[PDB]
Amino acid sequence: RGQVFDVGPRYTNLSYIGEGAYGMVCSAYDNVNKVRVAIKKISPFEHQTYCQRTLREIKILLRFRHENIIGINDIIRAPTIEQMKDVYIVQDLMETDLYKLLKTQHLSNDHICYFLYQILRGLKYIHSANVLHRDLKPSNLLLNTTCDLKICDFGLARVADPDHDHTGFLTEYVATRWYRAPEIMLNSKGYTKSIDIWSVGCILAEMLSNRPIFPGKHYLDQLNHILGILGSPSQEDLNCIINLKARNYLLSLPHKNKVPWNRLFPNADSKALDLLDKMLTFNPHKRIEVEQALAHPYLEQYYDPSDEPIAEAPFKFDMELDDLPKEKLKELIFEETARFQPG
């Protein structure tokens, strides 16, 4: 989605950055703030899925205000719904992301520590709003040249719903395979906060070695990669999987002993590995919570709960947007973007 790039007179001296899952991304000079910013041209109005994700992201990002979550500084669009055919989203310029950094750069322990702190600080706010991100991974963590980290891509986000999380074995799932918690493949729809903690643990492992820890090649391969490192689940953890197809799949597998974290990550700080172990815990009920992770000894130099804000306005709104005709989705996008119009 990119050809014309008409961002009015405020933004000039445009440079192409790339394509995304919505359209085209450029940098531009903000003649009001006198800084270079990122601008995304979104052309979603042809497909239900793009419109749903666009509405979801705009609604969430306009409600959230946090240093470790990307914000929206401005939205440019036509003054009427009839003329609205693109939407331009203006954001702070972030020169890289963790995916790109990990392909070429070794991270010092101090950087791993700082990045993890920022991820968890942002996630604390998201979770305090009763929101689940559900697609945390290196490419959804933006960084600027001073190492400020901001979480992005709320296209798969949902309101937490633990009472309706249960599903059968092998239920289809959308979020990126390598960062899926084991329970997704067994009995979970990904409607609890523990699914995001698993993804952070995978990101931590990837920061330690520059390689994905569980690079499954297919849906069930993801689970087998996890079990190849964690070892076979204990009787106690298996008794928490009540659905027979999932239980009996696990019981059919050969016994595997746990691979020690220090053999996988021989150069890692021992406190980092202790926290990694608690994030990559098989049983989601025993898995560490975001605030316990912030309080872990590994992060003691940064931990400051009074400087780790929570949301004022937790979500009870609709982020499913599934039973809405495209006409109403377009109208809702128009209404959500109205605050940036001169009027």
Ligand X SMILES: O=c1ccoc2cc(O)cc(O)c12
Interface region with ligand X, contact rule CB under 6 A, candidates 49-57, 79-87, 88-96, 107-115: 88-96
Residue 20, annotated as binding a ligand: yes
**Catalytically annotated residue among 74, 97, 135, 153:** 135
Interface region with ligand X, contact rule CB under 6 A, candidates 91-99, 107-115, 186-194, 327-335: 91-99
> Between residues 20 and 314, which has the closer beta carbon with respect to ligand X?
20
Q: Is 190 left (phi over 0), alpha (psi -120 to 50) or beta?
A: left
Side-chain-facing half-sphere of 291: CA atoms under 13 Å: 10
Rounded distance between C-alpha atoms, residue 343 and residue 325, angstroms: 27
> Which residues from 123-162 bind ligand X, rule CB under 6 A?
142, 152
Contact between residue 161 and residue 319 where contact means Cβ atoms under 8 Å apart: no
> Between residues 20 and 309, which has the closer beta carbon with respect to ligand X?
20
Nearest Cα neighbor of 225 from 271, 179, 188 is 179
Q: Which of 70, 101, 151, 156 binds ligand X (CB under 6 A)?
A: 70
Nearest Cα neighbor of 137 from 224, 91, 195 is 195
29 phi and psi, to 5 degrees?
-90, 125
Q: Which of 20, 231, 309, 314 binds ligand X (CB under 6 A)?
A: 20
Rounded distance between C-alpha atoms, residue 57 and residue 70, angstroms: 11
Q: Is 62 an interacting residue with respect to ligand X (CB under 6 A)?
A: no
Is 135 noted as a catalytic residue in this protein?
yes
Rounded distance between C-alpha atoms, residue 214 and residue 228, angstroms: 9
Beta strands in 152-219 (DSSP E): 158-159
Smallest distance, ligand X to C-beta of residue 142, A:
6
DSSP letter string, 128-148: HTTEE-----GGGEEE-TT--
Identify the sign of the CA torsion 176, 182, 188, 191: negative
Tell me which H or E stretch contains 132.
Answer: strand 131-132
Interface region with ligand X, contact rule CB under 6 A, candidates 89-97, 194-202, 215-223, 288-296: 89-97
Residue 84, annotated as binding a ligand: no
Q: Which of 43, 52, 68, 91 binds ligand X (CB under 6 A)?
A: 91
Rounded distance between C-alpha atoms, residue 95 and residue 61, angstroms: 20
Q: Which of 25, 101, 205, 275 binds ligand X (CB under 6 A)?
A: 25
Interface region with ligand X, contact rule CB under 6 A, candidates 90-98, 120-128, 193-201, 280-288: 90-98
Smallest distance, ligand X to C-beta of residue 87, A:
14
Residue 24, annotated as binding a ligand: yes
Residues touching ligand X: how many (CB under 6 A)?
10
113 phi and psi, to 5 degrees?
-60, -50
> Between residues 2 and 231, which has the closer beta carbon with respect to ligand X?
2
Smallest distance, ligand X to C-beta of residue 16, A:
11
Q: Is 94 an interacting residue with respect to ligand X (CB under 6 A)?
A: yes
Residues annotated as catalytic (active site), given as ranges: 135
As annotated, the binding site for ATP includes: 17-25, 40
Interacting residues with ligand X (CB under 6 A): 17, 20, 25, 38, 70, 91, 93-94, 142, 152
